[PDB]
Coordinates of C-alpha atoms in Angstrom, one line a residue:
Chain A
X129 CA -42.4 130.8 -192.3
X130 CA -43.0 131.8 -196.0
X131 CA -39.4 132.9 -196.3
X132 CA -38.0 129.8 -194.6
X133 CA -40.1 127.6 -196.9
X134 CA -38.8 129.4 -200.0
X135 CA -35.2 128.6 -198.7
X136 CA -36.3 125.0 -197.9
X137 CA -37.2 124.3 -201.5
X138 CA -33.9 125.3 -202.9
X139 CA -31.8 123.5 -200.3
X140 CA -33.9 120.3 -200.9
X141 CA -33.1 120.8 -204.6
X142 CA -29.3 120.7 -204.2
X143 CA -29.5 118.1 -201.5
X144 CA -31.3 115.8 -204.0
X145 CA -28.6 116.6 -206.6
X146 CA -25.8 115.6 -204.2
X147 CA -27.8 112.5 -203.3
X148 CA -28.0 111.5 -207.0
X149 CA -24.2 112.2 -207.3
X150 CA -23.4 109.9 -204.4
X151 CA -25.7 107.2 -205.7
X152 CA -23.9 107.4 -209.1
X153 CA -20.4 107.0 -207.5
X154 CA -21.7 104.3 -205.0
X155 CA -24.1 102.2 -207.0
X156 CA -27.4 100.8 -205.6
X157 CA -26.9 100.8 -201.8
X158 CA -30.4 102.0 -200.9
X159 CA -31.8 98.6 -199.9
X160 CA -28.9 98.2 -197.5
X161 CA -29.7 101.2 -195.4
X162 CA -33.4 100.4 -195.8
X163 CA -32.9 97.0 -194.2
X164 CA -30.3 98.2 -191.6
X165 CA -32.6 100.6 -189.6
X166 CA -32.3 99.7 -185.9
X167 CA -32.1 103.0 -183.9
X168 CA -32.4 106.7 -184.4
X169 CA -30.0 109.4 -183.3
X170 CA -32.0 112.5 -184.1
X171 CA -34.8 113.2 -181.7
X172 CA -37.1 116.1 -180.8
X173 CA -38.9 117.5 -177.7
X174 CA -41.6 120.0 -177.1
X175 CA -41.1 123.1 -174.9
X176 CA -43.7 125.8 -174.1
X177 CA -43.5 129.5 -174.9
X178 CA -46.1 132.0 -173.8
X179 CA -46.5 135.5 -175.4
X180 CA -49.2 137.9 -174.2
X181 CA -50.8 135.2 -172.0
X182 CA -51.3 132.6 -174.7
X183 CA -49.2 129.5 -175.1
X184 CA -47.7 128.0 -178.3
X185 CA -45.4 125.0 -178.8
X186 CA -41.8 124.9 -179.9
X187 CA -39.7 122.0 -181.1
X188 CA -36.0 121.5 -180.3
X189 CA -33.4 119.0 -181.8
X190 CA -31.4 116.7 -179.6
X191 CA -28.3 115.0 -181.1
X192 CA -28.1 111.6 -179.3
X193 CA -24.5 110.3 -179.4
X194 CA -25.0 107.2 -181.5
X195 CA -25.0 106.0 -185.1
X196 CA -25.8 102.9 -187.2
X197 CA -24.4 103.7 -190.7
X198 CA -21.2 105.2 -189.4
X199 CA -19.2 102.9 -191.8
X200 CA -21.5 101.8 -194.6
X201 CA -19.6 101.2 -197.8
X202 CA -16.2 101.2 -196.2
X203 CA -14.4 99.2 -198.9
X204 CA -15.8 101.3 -201.9
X205 CA -16.3 104.9 -200.7
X206 CA -18.1 106.8 -198.0
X207 CA -17.1 110.4 -198.3
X208 CA -19.9 111.5 -200.6
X209 CA -22.2 109.6 -198.2
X210 CA -20.8 111.8 -195.3
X211 CA -21.5 114.9 -197.3
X212 CA -25.0 113.6 -197.7
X213 CA -25.1 113.0 -193.9
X214 CA -24.1 116.6 -192.9
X215 CA -26.4 118.1 -195.6
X216 CA -29.4 116.1 -194.4
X217 CA -28.6 116.9 -190.8
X218 CA -28.7 120.6 -191.4
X219 CA -31.8 120.0 -193.5
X220 CA -33.4 118.2 -190.5
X221 CA -32.5 121.2 -188.4
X222 CA -34.2 123.6 -190.8
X223 CA -37.2 121.4 -191.2
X224 CA -37.7 121.1 -187.5
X225 CA -37.4 124.8 -187.1
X226 CA -40.1 125.6 -189.7
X227 CA -42.3 122.8 -188.2
Chain B
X60 CA 0.6 77.5 -222.9
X61 CA 4.2 77.7 -221.7
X62 CA 5.1 80.3 -224.3
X63 CA 3.1 78.4 -226.9
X64 CA -0.4 79.8 -227.0
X65 CA -2.8 79.6 -230.0
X66 CA -2.7 75.8 -229.9
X67 CA -5.8 75.3 -227.7
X68 CA -7.3 78.8 -227.0
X69 CA -8.4 79.7 -230.5
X70 CA -9.4 76.1 -231.3
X71 CA -12.1 76.1 -228.7
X72 CA -12.9 79.8 -228.2
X73 CA -12.6 81.6 -231.5
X74 CA -16.4 82.1 -231.8
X75 CA -16.7 83.4 -228.3
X76 CA -13.8 85.8 -229.0
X77 CA -15.7 87.0 -232.1
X78 CA -18.9 87.6 -230.0
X79 CA -17.1 89.5 -227.2
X80 CA -15.3 91.8 -229.7
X81 CA -18.5 92.3 -231.8
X82 CA -20.2 93.5 -228.7
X83 CA -17.1 95.6 -228.0
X84 CA -17.7 97.1 -231.5
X85 CA -21.0 98.6 -230.3
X86 CA -19.3 100.6 -227.6
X87 CA -20.2 104.3 -227.6
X88 CA -17.8 106.9 -229.0
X89 CA -17.0 110.5 -228.0
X90 CA -19.2 111.6 -231.0
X91 CA -22.1 109.8 -229.2
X92 CA -21.3 111.8 -226.1
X93 CA -21.3 115.0 -228.0
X94 CA -24.7 114.0 -229.6
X95 CA -26.3 113.1 -226.3
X96 CA -25.1 116.0 -224.2
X97 CA -27.4 118.3 -226.2
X98 CA -30.7 116.5 -225.5
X99 CA -32.2 118.7 -222.6
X100 CA -35.1 116.3 -222.1
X101 CA -35.5 112.5 -221.8
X102 CA -37.6 112.3 -224.9
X103 CA -34.7 113.7 -226.9
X104 CA -32.4 111.3 -225.0
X105 CA -34.3 108.2 -226.3
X106 CA -34.6 109.8 -229.7
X107 CA -30.8 110.2 -229.9
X108 CA -30.1 106.8 -228.4
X109 CA -32.2 105.4 -231.2
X110 CA -29.2 105.9 -233.4
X111 CA -26.9 103.7 -231.4
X112 CA -27.3 99.9 -230.8
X113 CA -29.9 100.6 -228.0
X114 CA -32.4 101.7 -230.6
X115 CA -36.1 100.7 -230.8
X116 CA -35.9 99.1 -227.3
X117 CA -36.8 102.2 -225.4
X118 CA -40.1 102.4 -227.3
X119 CA -43.3 100.3 -226.7
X120 CA -42.8 100.9 -222.9
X121 CA -42.6 103.5 -220.2
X122 CA -45.2 106.1 -221.1
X123 CA -43.7 108.2 -218.4
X124 CA -39.9 108.5 -218.2
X125 CA -37.7 108.2 -215.1
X126 CA -34.3 107.1 -214.1
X127 CA -35.5 103.7 -212.8
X128 CA -36.8 102.5 -216.2
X129 CA -33.5 103.3 -218.1
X130 CA -31.4 101.9 -215.2
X131 CA -33.1 98.5 -214.9
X132 CA -33.5 98.3 -218.7
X133 CA -29.8 98.7 -219.2
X134 CA -29.3 96.2 -216.4
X135 CA -31.7 93.8 -218.2
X136 CA -29.8 94.1 -221.5
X137 CA -26.6 93.5 -219.6
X138 CA -27.8 90.3 -217.9
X139 CA -29.4 88.8 -221.0
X140 CA -26.4 89.5 -223.2
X141 CA -23.9 88.1 -220.6
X142 CA -26.1 85.0 -220.1
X143 CA -26.3 84.4 -223.8
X144 CA -22.5 84.8 -224.0
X145 CA -21.9 82.5 -221.1
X146 CA -24.2 79.5 -221.7
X147 CA -22.2 78.4 -224.8
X148 CA -18.9 78.3 -222.9
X149 CA -16.3 75.6 -222.4
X150 CA -14.9 74.7 -219.0
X151 CA -11.8 77.0 -219.0
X152 CA -14.2 79.9 -219.6
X153 CA -16.8 78.4 -217.3
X154 CA -14.5 78.9 -214.4
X155 CA -14.1 82.6 -215.2
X156 CA -17.8 83.3 -215.9
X157 CA -18.7 81.4 -212.7
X158 CA -16.4 83.9 -211.0
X159 CA -18.2 86.7 -212.7
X160 CA -21.4 85.4 -211.2
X161 CA -19.8 84.9 -207.8
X162 CA -18.4 88.5 -207.6
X163 CA -22.0 89.6 -207.4
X164 CA -23.3 86.5 -205.6
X165 CA -21.2 87.9 -202.7
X166 CA -23.5 91.0 -202.7
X167 CA -26.5 88.7 -203.1
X168 CA -25.6 86.8 -199.9
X169 CA -25.0 90.2 -198.3
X170 CA -28.7 90.9 -199.1
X171 CA -29.9 87.4 -198.0
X172 CA -28.3 87.7 -194.5
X173 CA -29.9 90.1 -192.0
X174 CA -33.2 88.5 -193.1
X175 CA -33.3 86.2 -190.1
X176 CA -32.0 88.9 -187.9
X177 CA -35.1 91.0 -188.7
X178 CA -37.4 87.9 -189.3
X179 CA -38.1 88.4 -193.0
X180 CA -39.3 86.0 -195.7
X181 CA -37.4 85.2 -198.9
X182 CA -39.9 86.0 -201.6
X183 CA -39.9 89.7 -200.7
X184 CA -36.1 89.8 -200.9
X185 CA -35.9 87.8 -204.2
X186 CA -36.8 90.8 -206.5
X187 CA -34.0 92.9 -205.0
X188 CA -31.3 90.3 -205.7
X189 CA -28.7 91.2 -208.3
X190 CA -29.9 89.6 -211.6
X191 CA -26.4 88.3 -212.5
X192 CA -26.3 86.5 -209.2
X193 CA -29.9 85.0 -209.3
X194 CA -28.4 81.5 -208.8
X195 CA -31.7 79.8 -209.8
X196 CA -31.4 77.3 -207.0
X197 CA -34.0 75.5 -204.9
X198 CA -34.1 75.3 -201.0
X199 CA -33.2 79.0 -200.9
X200 CA -36.7 79.6 -199.4
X201 CA -38.7 78.7 -196.3
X202 CA -35.8 79.5 -194.0
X203 CA -38.1 79.7 -190.9
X204 CA -36.0 82.7 -189.5
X205 CA -33.4 80.3 -188.2
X206 CA -29.7 81.1 -188.8
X207 CA -28.4 77.5 -188.4
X208 CA -30.3 76.2 -191.4
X209 CA -29.3 79.3 -193.3
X210 CA -25.7 78.2 -192.7
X211 CA -26.8 74.8 -194.0
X212 CA -28.4 76.3 -197.1
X213 CA -25.5 78.5 -198.0
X214 CA -23.2 75.5 -197.5
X215 CA -25.2 73.0 -199.6
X216 CA -26.1 75.2 -202.6
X217 CA -23.5 77.9 -202.9
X218 CA -19.9 77.1 -203.9
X219 CA -18.7 80.1 -201.9
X220 CA -19.2 77.5 -199.1
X221 CA -15.5 76.9 -199.8
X222 CA -14.8 80.3 -198.2
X223 CA -17.5 79.9 -195.6
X224 CA -15.8 76.6 -194.7
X225 CA -13.0 78.4 -192.7
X226 CA -13.4 82.2 -192.9
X227 CA -16.8 82.2 -191.2
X228 CA -18.5 80.6 -188.2
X229 CA -22.0 81.0 -186.8
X230 CA -20.5 83.1 -184.0
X231 CA -19.0 85.5 -186.6
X232 CA -22.4 85.5 -188.3
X233 CA -24.5 86.5 -185.4
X234 CA -22.1 88.8 -183.5
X235 CA -19.9 90.5 -186.1
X236 CA -21.4 93.0 -188.4
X237 CA -22.1 92.5 -192.1
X238 CA -19.5 94.9 -193.6
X239 CA -16.2 93.4 -192.3
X240 CA -17.7 90.0 -193.1
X241 CA -18.3 90.9 -196.8
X242 CA -14.9 92.6 -196.9
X243 CA -13.2 89.4 -195.7
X244 CA -15.2 87.2 -198.1
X245 CA -14.3 89.6 -201.0
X246 CA -10.6 89.4 -200.0
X247 CA -10.6 85.6 -199.9
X248 CA -12.5 85.5 -203.1
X249 CA -10.0 87.7 -204.9
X250 CA -7.2 85.5 -203.6
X251 CA -9.0 82.4 -204.9
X252 CA -9.3 84.1 -208.3
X253 CA -5.6 85.1 -208.3
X254 CA -4.4 81.6 -207.5
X255 CA -6.7 80.1 -210.1
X256 CA -5.3 82.6 -212.7
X257 CA -1.7 81.7 -211.9
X258 CA -2.7 78.0 -212.2
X259 CA -3.7 78.7 -215.8
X260 CA -0.5 80.5 -216.8
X261 CA 0.5 81.9 -220.1
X262 CA -0.5 85.2 -221.8
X263 CA -3.8 85.1 -219.7
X264 CA -1.7 85.6 -216.6
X265 CA 0.2 88.4 -218.2
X266 CA -3.0 90.2 -219.0
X267 CA -4.8 89.5 -215.7
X268 CA -2.1 90.1 -213.1
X269 CA -2.1 93.9 -213.3
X270 CA -5.9 94.2 -213.1
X271 CA -6.2 92.1 -209.9
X272 CA -3.1 93.7 -208.4
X273 CA -4.5 97.2 -208.8
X274 CA -7.9 95.9 -207.6
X275 CA -6.2 94.8 -204.3
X276 CA -4.2 98.0 -204.0
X277 CA -7.3 100.2 -204.6
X278 CA -9.3 98.2 -202.0
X279 CA -6.5 98.6 -199.5
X280 CA -6.3 102.3 -200.0
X281 CA -10.0 102.8 -199.8
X282 CA -10.3 100.9 -196.5
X283 CA -7.3 102.8 -195.2
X284 CA -8.8 106.2 -195.9
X285 CA -12.3 105.3 -194.7
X286 CA -11.0 103.6 -191.5
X287 CA -10.0 107.1 -190.1
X288 CA -13.5 108.3 -189.3
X289 CA -14.5 105.0 -187.5
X290 CA -13.5 103.6 -184.2
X291 CA -12.2 100.3 -185.7
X292 CA -8.9 99.1 -184.2
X293 CA -5.8 99.0 -186.4
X294 CA -5.4 95.2 -186.1
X295 CA -8.8 94.9 -187.8
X296 CA -7.5 97.1 -190.6
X297 CA -4.5 94.9 -190.9
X298 CA -6.8 91.9 -191.3
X299 CA -9.0 93.6 -193.9
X300 CA -6.2 94.2 -196.4
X301 CA -5.7 91.4 -199.0
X302 CA -2.5 89.3 -199.3
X303 CA -2.1 90.1 -203.0
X304 CA -1.1 93.8 -203.1
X305 CA 2.4 95.0 -204.0
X306 CA 2.6 96.5 -200.5
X307 CA 2.1 93.1 -198.8
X308 CA 5.8 92.4 -198.3
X309 CA 6.1 95.9 -196.7
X310 CA 4.0 99.1 -196.6
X311 CA 0.6 97.6 -195.9
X312 CA 1.5 97.5 -192.2
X313 CA 2.8 101.0 -192.6
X314 CA -0.6 102.0 -194.0
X315 CA -2.4 100.2 -191.1
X316 CA -0.3 101.9 -188.5
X317 CA -0.7 105.4 -190.0
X318 CA -3.5 107.4 -188.5
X319 CA -3.2 110.6 -190.6
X320 CA -4.0 111.4 -194.2
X321 CA -0.6 113.0 -194.8
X322 CA 1.1 109.8 -193.6
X323 CA -1.0 107.7 -196.1
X324 CA -0.1 110.2 -198.8
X325 CA 3.6 109.8 -198.0
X326 CA 3.4 106.0 -198.0
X327 CA 1.5 106.0 -201.3
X328 CA 4.1 108.4 -202.8
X329 CA 6.7 105.6 -203.1
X330 CA 5.4 104.3 -206.4
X331 CA 5.4 106.6 -209.4
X332 CA 2.0 106.3 -211.1
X333 CA 0.5 106.3 -207.6
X334 CA 2.4 109.6 -207.0
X335 CA 0.8 111.0 -210.2
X336 CA -2.7 109.7 -209.1
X337 CA -2.5 111.2 -205.6
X338 CA -1.0 114.6 -206.6
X339 CA -3.6 114.8 -209.3
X340 CA -6.3 114.5 -206.6
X341 CA -6.4 118.0 -205.4
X342 CA -9.7 117.2 -203.7
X343 CA -10.8 120.9 -203.5
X344 CA -14.2 122.3 -204.4
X345 CA -13.8 122.4 -208.2
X346 CA -11.8 119.4 -209.3
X347 CA -12.4 115.6 -209.3
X348 CA -11.3 113.3 -206.5
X349 CA -9.4 110.1 -205.8
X350 CA -12.1 107.5 -206.7
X351 CA -12.6 109.3 -210.1
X352 CA -8.9 108.9 -210.8
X353 CA -9.1 105.2 -209.8
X354 CA -11.9 104.9 -212.3
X355 CA -9.8 106.3 -215.1
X356 CA -7.0 103.9 -214.1
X357 CA -9.4 101.0 -214.2
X358 CA -10.7 101.8 -217.6
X359 CA -7.3 102.5 -219.1
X360 CA -6.0 99.2 -217.8
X361 CA -9.0 97.5 -219.3
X362 CA -8.2 99.3 -222.5
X363 CA -4.7 97.9 -222.5
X364 CA -6.4 94.6 -221.8
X365 CA -8.5 94.5 -225.0
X366 CA -5.4 95.5 -227.0
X367 CA -4.3 91.9 -226.5
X368 CA -6.5 89.2 -228.1
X369 CA -5.1 85.8 -227.2
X370 CA -6.5 85.6 -223.6
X371 CA -9.7 85.4 -221.5
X372 CA -9.2 89.0 -220.2
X373 CA -11.2 90.0 -223.3
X374 CA -13.9 87.9 -221.6
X375 CA -13.8 90.3 -218.5
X376 CA -12.8 93.8 -219.5
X377 CA -15.8 94.6 -221.6
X378 CA -18.0 93.6 -218.7
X379 CA -16.5 96.1 -216.4
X380 CA -16.3 98.8 -219.1
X381 CA -19.9 98.2 -220.1
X382 CA -21.0 98.6 -216.5
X383 CA -19.2 101.9 -216.6
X384 CA -21.1 102.8 -219.8
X385 CA -24.4 102.0 -218.3
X386 CA -23.9 104.1 -215.2
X387 CA -22.7 106.9 -217.5
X388 CA -26.0 106.8 -219.4
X389 CA -27.8 106.9 -216.0
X390 CA -25.7 110.0 -215.1
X391 CA -26.8 111.7 -218.4
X392 CA -30.4 111.1 -217.6
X393 CA -29.9 112.3 -214.0
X394 CA -28.4 115.6 -215.3
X395 CA -31.4 116.0 -217.5
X396 CA -33.6 115.3 -214.5
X397 CA -32.0 118.0 -212.4
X398 CA -31.2 120.7 -215.1
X399 CA -27.7 121.0 -213.6
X400 CA -25.3 122.1 -216.4
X401 CA -22.0 122.8 -214.6
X402 CA -21.3 119.0 -214.2
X403 CA -22.3 117.6 -217.6
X404 CA -18.7 117.1 -218.6
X405 CA -18.1 115.0 -215.5
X406 CA -18.3 111.7 -217.4
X407 CA -15.6 109.2 -217.9
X408 CA -14.7 109.2 -221.6
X409 CA -14.4 105.5 -222.5
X410 CA -14.2 105.6 -226.3
Chain C
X204 CA -35.1 112.4 -176.6
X205 CA -37.9 110.0 -177.5
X206 CA -39.9 111.6 -180.2
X207 CA -38.9 110.9 -183.8
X208 CA -39.6 112.2 -187.3
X209 CA -41.8 109.9 -189.5
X210 CA -41.5 110.2 -193.3
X211 CA -43.6 108.8 -196.1
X212 CA -42.2 109.3 -199.6
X213 CA -40.3 107.9 -202.5
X214 CA -37.1 105.9 -202.3
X215 CA -34.6 108.8 -202.6
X216 CA -36.1 110.9 -199.8
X217 CA -36.5 108.0 -197.4
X218 CA -32.9 106.9 -198.1
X219 CA -31.5 110.3 -197.5
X220 CA -33.5 110.8 -194.3
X221 CA -32.7 107.4 -192.9
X222 CA -29.1 108.5 -193.6
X223 CA -29.9 111.7 -191.8
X224 CA -30.5 109.6 -188.6
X225 CA -34.3 109.3 -188.2
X226 CA -35.6 105.7 -187.9
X227 CA -36.7 103.4 -185.1
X228 CA -38.5 100.1 -184.6
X229 CA -40.7 100.1 -181.5
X230 CA -41.1 97.3 -179.0
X231 CA -43.7 95.7 -181.4
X232 CA -41.4 96.0 -184.4
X233 CA -43.3 98.5 -186.5
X234 CA -41.5 101.0 -188.8
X235 CA -41.9 104.8 -188.6
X236 CA -42.0 105.0 -192.4
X237 CA -43.5 103.4 -195.5
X238 CA -41.9 103.2 -199.0
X239 CA -44.1 104.2 -201.9
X240 CA -43.8 103.0 -205.5
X241 CA -46.0 102.4 -208.5
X242 CA -47.8 99.4 -206.9
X243 CA -48.8 101.0 -203.6
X244 CA -52.5 100.9 -203.0
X245 CA -54.6 103.9 -201.9
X246 CA -56.4 102.1 -199.0
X247 CA -53.1 101.0 -197.5
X248 CA -51.4 104.4 -197.6
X249 CA -54.4 106.2 -196.1
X250 CA -54.8 103.4 -193.5
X251 CA -51.1 103.7 -192.5
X252 CA -51.5 107.5 -192.4
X253 CA -54.4 107.0 -189.9
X254 CA -52.2 104.6 -187.9
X255 CA -49.4 107.2 -187.7
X256 CA -51.8 109.9 -186.7
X257 CA -53.0 107.7 -183.9
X258 CA -49.4 107.0 -182.7
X259 CA -48.2 109.4 -180.0
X260 CA -44.5 109.3 -180.6
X261 CA -44.1 111.1 -184.0
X262 CA -44.9 114.8 -183.8
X263 CA -43.7 115.6 -187.3
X264 CA -44.7 114.0 -190.6
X265 CA -43.2 114.8 -194.0
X266 CA -45.1 114.2 -197.3
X267 CA -44.0 114.9 -200.9
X268 CA -46.4 116.8 -203.2
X269 CA -48.1 114.1 -205.2
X270 CA -48.7 111.8 -202.2
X271 CA -50.3 114.7 -200.4
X272 CA -52.4 115.4 -203.4
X273 CA -53.6 111.8 -203.6
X274 CA -54.6 111.9 -199.9
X275 CA -55.5 115.6 -199.9
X276 CA -59.0 114.9 -198.5
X277 CA -57.7 113.4 -195.2
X278 CA -55.2 116.3 -194.8
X279 CA -58.0 118.8 -195.3
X280 CA -60.0 116.8 -192.8
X281 CA -57.1 117.1 -190.4
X282 CA -57.7 120.0 -187.9
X283 CA -55.1 119.3 -185.1
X284 CA -51.9 121.0 -184.1
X285 CA -49.6 118.6 -182.2
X286 CA -49.4 116.2 -185.2
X287 CA -47.7 118.8 -187.4
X288 CA -47.7 118.2 -191.2
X289 CA -45.3 119.7 -193.7
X290 CA -44.6 119.4 -197.4
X291 CA -41.4 118.7 -199.4
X292 CA -40.5 118.8 -203.1
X293 CA -39.7 115.7 -205.2
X294 CA -37.6 114.9 -208.3
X295 CA -40.3 115.1 -211.0
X296 CA -42.8 117.2 -209.0
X297 CA -41.2 120.7 -208.5
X298 CA -42.9 122.4 -205.6
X299 CA -45.6 125.0 -206.1
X300 CA -46.7 127.4 -203.5
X301 CA -50.4 127.2 -204.3
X302 CA -51.0 123.7 -202.8
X303 CA -50.7 123.4 -199.0
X304 CA -53.3 123.1 -196.2
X305 CA -51.5 125.6 -193.9
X306 CA -52.1 128.2 -196.6
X307 CA -55.8 127.3 -196.6
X308 CA -55.8 128.0 -192.9
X309 CA -54.6 131.5 -193.7
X310 CA -56.1 131.8 -197.2
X311 CA -55.7 135.1 -199.0
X312 CA -52.7 136.4 -197.0
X313 CA -50.3 135.9 -199.9

């Protein structure tokens, strides 16, 4: 967990850098996605795992087949936003794992 | 007019021309870029911006420093300067500056809608409105979470009710999603602007035709490239394009029918400067990309615009270029805030 | 399938995470997040933190450094397992390894 957290800090660093880059090239779109939240697509579920007779929990990521912001900013640019999407998806994977 | 300018334009707009170019005089230079790229901390950034016309404003405020304060301060200076410029204007200019307001009132009404869909009140949305499109009008409140009276409100107060008159219905409002709606409104708005510009011919039309033409073409190309990843049908794409582009007689349908990036590249490769733009876009990890090139094209065309002086294009170009300058400053502060040094030189060099 | 990540933080992180795909409104129309700014009161943030702790549909909560510091007393009072709590960096607060409750649970094993 210590090692994974050390990796987490750096990946958050460049994720925030790319976020700021996309915000520069796209203007102030934050309030849009803030107000357009309707449904999630990432979810989690808890399985059990017993070692040496004692139980501990484990979390797993499910990728529901749905989206809400699939085409935000279609007339100005959305490729940097898609880079943010995949970056933050792999971030969510890592965060759920260390959780 | 009619090959005989400088009989009416100067007589009634000389002073405003003087202001717009005096403000253009305060544009930053490459020397300023060289001076500010060696700050390494926001305190040094304000200390070096003290030299330029933004000096002494950053002080007496913001004991801590962050991107937000500089961003909304530059926005504040923008809006107060424009408003001061605009509210001494005469009617031929009043049309144009009303359009400048409206081009962001479109995004304002984007923000306003979806309020009733999520049952929200106005006064919490009002701060997040774009300052240039404040619109300062009554009966924009107490909407009671009812879309019909919202239709009524946008009709009665907003002169984009002309576009809402035919391009939108209540069914489109409460079934179709916000983004195709705002795209269609922006298209109809640009077409209204174009026909108004042609109505007022002369040298103004000569200056303004290329900017609006490239605006339409860039919008078309952007929607074409972004439509790939979505499930949207091709007929919707065909609708979304404007009727002003050079490709409208032919080649816009070709772009709509094309479903591959190479096909779009081939279609775009039939006009020389667009060939240069697209081949320049290597789009690999280590060079800039298409929208950057479009930004350089926009600024160079605005530069060609200020080169001319007998026209109301000098009453537009600085606005767009000044916006670019503001976001450039925000980029500088961002790079300071991240200590990322391999992308400092990724700023558009406008003067 | 039904459980979701809740996040409380500044505007950039919540924007990027809502982009990441988290985010729901329940049947009673209550968000799974709260945006923090300069004019966000202490009582309201700790109250909403208690509300999220009570809610049985989150599992994971994310907090940036300074918000955790300002509500550190409740986090130290927290002694449960299923409502897991983690920490994330921020733009102006670079993360430091010497401030986290999970390390207090295993203090000295550095």
